[PDB]
Amino acid sequence: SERRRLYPPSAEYPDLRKHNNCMASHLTPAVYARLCDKTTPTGWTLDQCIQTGVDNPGHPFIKTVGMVAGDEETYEVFADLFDPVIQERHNGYDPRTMKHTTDLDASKIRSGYFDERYVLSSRVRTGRSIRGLSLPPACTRAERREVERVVVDALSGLKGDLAGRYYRLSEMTEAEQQQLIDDHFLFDKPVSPLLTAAGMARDWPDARGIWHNNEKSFLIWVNEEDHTRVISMEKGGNMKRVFERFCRGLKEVERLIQERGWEFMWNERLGYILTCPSNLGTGLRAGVHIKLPLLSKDSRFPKILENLRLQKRGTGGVDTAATGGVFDISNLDRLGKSEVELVQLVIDGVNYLIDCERRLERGQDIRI
C-alpha cells in the first residue's frame, strides 16, 4: 500500500548541538530536508556524506570539513551543502561563480635553492581520482581492485629515472611496513576516527599499495585516502628539483593513464575532484620539515604564518602532535591558486622565515 507514511526528514536530522565542524555550522533543517531524498547515480546519499562529521563532533578550535564525497557526481548533486563548506574552507573561493586554473610548469618557479638550516627535507604531494570509479568512501572491492590495476599497469610504463616497483601491502611484512612508515615513505592503517567513520578503512589492506622509484624520491600511494596520492620527496632543500620531478612524473602518469582510456576526475569549477573537500582544486601540499631552535622561541610566529599563508602541523602526521619543536610547514589553501603559485608562495614564505628566524639579532617584521 502507498498510504503508509515515511519518517519526516526532520525526524532524521542529526543532533549537532555540540559539534565544531563546517558541516555542523552550515547544515540547516531546510537544507537537510531538501537534500534528504536525492542520491548520486551510484547510490551515494547525504547521510553518507555527513556521517563522518556527525560521528566526530570535532575538537574546539580545530577546523575539520566533516564531509566526504562518494563519487564525482556528489559535488554536483549535493552542491547546496558543499558549496558553502568549500567557500568557507578555501578563504572565500566561490565554486558557483569563480573558476580554477591548473598550471604545473616547473619552469616558471624561480629561486629553488634553500639553506640547510631547518629545512632538512622538502616534499610535494597531490591526489588524483580515476573517472568512472567510486571514491574510497563508497568504492566496492571490485572498484578498488580496478583502480589498483589501472594505476599499476600505467606505472609499469614509466621509464628513465622515474622507474620503480609496486609493493602490495598484503604482501609486505609488518617489519618492512613499520620501517617504511618510520622513514616517512609509507602510510599506516587508518586509526583516526575521521577516516574510519567515513568508511575508508573497509577491507584493509586489500588493494592498497605503494609504488616507489628506485631512488625512493618519487612515490605513489594507491588506495589509502584517495585513488592515487603522488608524492615527490627530497632529503634536502632543492625545492626546484623536487617540483620539476613532481611535474614531469605527474605528466607521464597522466599520459599513461590516458593511453588506456582512463581520465582523472576534473571539472572547471572545482579542479581535480577528491574525497575531502579541503583537498579540492589542486590537492597540492608543498611543504618542508622545520626544527625548534630558531622557530620554537621567537616572538609572534603564528601571526607571521597566517600573514604569509603558511600552515604548520605536527611532524609524523596530522593526527600526531608536534614533538621537540619540530613541525611541518606547508601551504593552507588548495582551490583557487595554481600549483606553481602555491609552490612559489611556500618558497617565499620559507625564505622569509629563515630570514625572520632572528636569533643573531631582532627585528621580526611579519610584513603582511
Give me the residues that bind ligand ADP (CB under 6 A), please.
121, 123, 125, 184, 285, 287-289, 316-318, 328
Contact by Cβ (8 Å): 219, 123? no
Strand order in the sheet with 228-234: 164-168, 209-213, 218-222, 228-234, 122-128, 287-290, 327-331, 310-314
| Span near its own copies by CB under 8 A; candidates 24-32, 227-235, 245-253, 339-347 | 24-32
| Inter-CA distances, 292 with 11, 62, 295, 313, 323, Å | 51, 22, 5, 13, 9
Binds its own copies by CB under 8 A, chosen from 166, 185, 204, 352: 204
Least Cβ distance, residue 135 to ligand ADP (angstroms): 16
188 binds its own copies (CB under 8 A): no
| Inter-CA distances, 199 with 59, 67, 272, 283, Å | 20, 12, 21, 21
What end-to-end distance do the CA atoms of the chain give, in Å?
Answer: 66
Cα angle, residue 284 at apex, residues 280 and 286 outer, rounded to 5°: 155
* Amino acid of residue 355: D
Least Cβ distance, residue 138 to ligand ADP (angstroms): 20
By rule CB under 8 A, what string of x and - marks binding of each residue 28-67 to its own copies? -xx-xx--xxxx--xx-x-x---x--xx------------
Cα separation, 139 vs 193, whole angstroms: 19
Our CB check for its own copies shows the closer of 134 and 315 to be 134
* Amino acid of residue 178: Q
Our CB check for its own copies shows the closer of 187 and 327 to be 187
Contact by Cβ (8 Å): 277, 66? no
Among ligand ADP, its own copies, none, what does residue 360 contact (CB within 5–8 Å per kind)?
A: none
Among its own copies, ligand ADP, none, what does residue 15 contact (CB within 5–8 Å per kind)?
A: its own copies
Among its own copies, ligand ADP, none, what does residue 317 contact (CB within 5–8 Å per kind)?
A: ligand ADP
Binds its own copies by CB under 8 A, chosen from 64, 134, 232, 344: 134
216 binds its own copies (CB under 8 A): no
CB atoms within 10 A of CB 30: 10
List contacts with its own copies (CB under 8 A).
1-15, 17, 29-30, 32-33, 36-39, 42-43, 45, 47, 51, 54-55, 130-134, 140-143, 145-146, 149, 170, 196-197, 201-204, 206, 258-263
